[PDB]
Structures are given as structure tokens and as C-alpha cells.
Amino acid sequence: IQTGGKQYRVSEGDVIRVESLQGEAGDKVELKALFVGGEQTVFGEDAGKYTVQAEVVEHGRGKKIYIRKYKSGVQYRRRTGHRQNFTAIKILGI
């Protein structure tokens, strides 16, 4: 989301912002802000009673985008490259 997710998911391998804990395993725990993993509809802090476990899968770089900037008749043209650093995490959690 804004780094460090939440919600009832069914154990998927989603990609998020960099996590520091290199290679496989690493293991991460998330606060949780809402859930339906057991039909129980619980949200906020009462959701904090629970915590999702996720395993670090892969560290990566995003697809190459190009920063193009332009202003007319002021001779201004800017071309610079960009690639966004990420972390793939396999959800397991309670």
C-alpha cells in the first residue's frame, strides 16, 4: 500500500517497496487493519490483535520508464532514466 499492507488475502506473492532483509526467508509481520479470514468482520486495533506473516521472495528493479520533461521556446528538454526498487513477498499469515 504506503509500505506495509493489511486485509484478508488468500496467501499471494505481491510486490512492494524495498525491505532490507536480503535473499529468501527474511520473514515479515504486518499489523492488519481489516479481515474476513473466518467470516468475522473485524477492523482497526481490534485487527491489531491479529498479525500476518509473510516470507521475502525476491528483491528487484521495476520496468524501465523514462523521465521526459519539456518547456516550449525556452530550449528546455530533459531525458533521464528511472527504475523502481522493490521486494516480492509471499503472504502466509494468521
Partner 1 sequence: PRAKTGIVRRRRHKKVLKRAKGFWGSRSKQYRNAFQTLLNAATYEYRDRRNKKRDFRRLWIQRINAGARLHGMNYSTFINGLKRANIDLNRKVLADIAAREPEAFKALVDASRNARQ
Partner 2 sequence: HDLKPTPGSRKDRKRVGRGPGGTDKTAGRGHKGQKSRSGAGKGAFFEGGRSRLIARLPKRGFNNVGTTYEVVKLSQLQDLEDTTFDRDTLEAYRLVRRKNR
Partner RNA sequence: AAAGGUGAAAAGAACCCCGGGAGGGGAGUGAAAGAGAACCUGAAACCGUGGACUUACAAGCAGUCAUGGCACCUUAUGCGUGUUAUGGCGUGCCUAUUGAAGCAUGAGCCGGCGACUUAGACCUGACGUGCGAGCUUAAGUUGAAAAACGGAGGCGGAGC
Partner RNA sequence: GUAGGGGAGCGUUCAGUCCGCGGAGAAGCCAUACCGGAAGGAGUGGUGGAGCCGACUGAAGUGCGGAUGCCGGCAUGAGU
33 binds, among RNA, partner 2, partner 1, none (CB under 5 to 8 A by kind): partner 1
* Dihedral (CA of 67, 72, 77, 78) sign: negative
* Segment lying near partner 2 (by CB under 8 A), choices 4-12, 20-28, 43-51, 71-79: 71-79
Q: Residue 12 and residue 57: Cα distance in Å, rounded? A: 11
Residue from the set 9, 16, 26, 33 that interacts with partner 1 by CB under 8 A = 33
What's the closest the beta carbon of residue 75 comes to partner 2, in angstroms? 3
Q: Within positions 65 to 84, which residues make up the interface with partner 1, using CB under 8 A?
A: 67-70, 72, 77
Residue from the set 16, 22, 80, 90 that interacts with RNA by CB under 7 A = 80
Q: Is 2 helix (H, G, I), strand (E, B) or coil?
A: coil
Q: How far is C-alpha 68 from the geometric centre of its chain's CA atoms?
A: 26
Would you say 22 or 85 has its CB closer to RNA?
A: 85
